[PDB]
Structures are given as structure tokens and as C-alpha cells.
Amino acid sequence: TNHKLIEAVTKSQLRTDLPSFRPGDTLRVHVRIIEGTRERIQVFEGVVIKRRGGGVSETFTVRKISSGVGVERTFPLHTPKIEKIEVKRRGKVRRAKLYYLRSLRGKAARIQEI
């Protein structure tokens, strides 16, 4: 085979427990920080900016505001360093990428659920 070979390998590495979502969604994300001492978990909460092509390359991004400070975190999908994921919410979007939100703060940056 010249065409199915790659996927035939990398299926060994992929993960399956994960849900399906899309942009518009508000998410909670449990992640396995290994400090020098232990394998402490923490959570990030955010907003589905994007995700691009499939496989291991399926890889996505979330937005947050810390202190009025827009922060963006961008992760693989099938990495092991996620413990868990939650769909906290949906939203009625009409794009596939949400780059048009890095400019705005507040009720300007408001979302309808679903």
C-alpha cells in the first residue's frame, strides 16, 4: 500500500475516549503537569478557537482571559498528557476559526450557548 500505510501505523498511538465538539464551545480540560516532584493535575477552561486536519495532526486551540489578559493554549488531541476533557458548553457559531476575538474584551466577546 502507498496510501493507507501512515494511518496504519499511527493508529497505534491515537486515542479514542475523547468526545466530539466544534467551535462555539466552552470546555474544561484536565492536564497532567509533571512538576519536579509529582504528576499534579490542573485544569484549563476555555473556548474552542479551532482545530485542523485529522490524525495525530488533529490539533486544536482554546482561549481564556486571566486578568483581562487574553491567553491561548493550543494542544494536540491524542497526546497522553491530557487526563480528561469536558464539554461544559456549546455555542452557535458561523465560522470554523475564531481569530476575530483576540481584539475584543467583555460582552463584545459574548457567546450564545448552543
Binding site: 502507498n2 499511527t10 495525530v56 497526546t79 498528557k81
Partner: peptide, 14 residues
């Protein structure tokens, strides 16, 4: 040569 990909080795290392 066929292509290139990414792999999560040990340590969750990419």
C-alpha cells in the same frame, strides 16, 4: 520516503 508525522513518545514527548 513516504512522509512525515508526529509521535507521542515517552513522557508524552512529541
Amino acid at each position: 520516503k513516504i512522509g512525515m508525522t508526529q509521535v507521542f513518545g515517552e513522557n508524552g514527548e512529541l
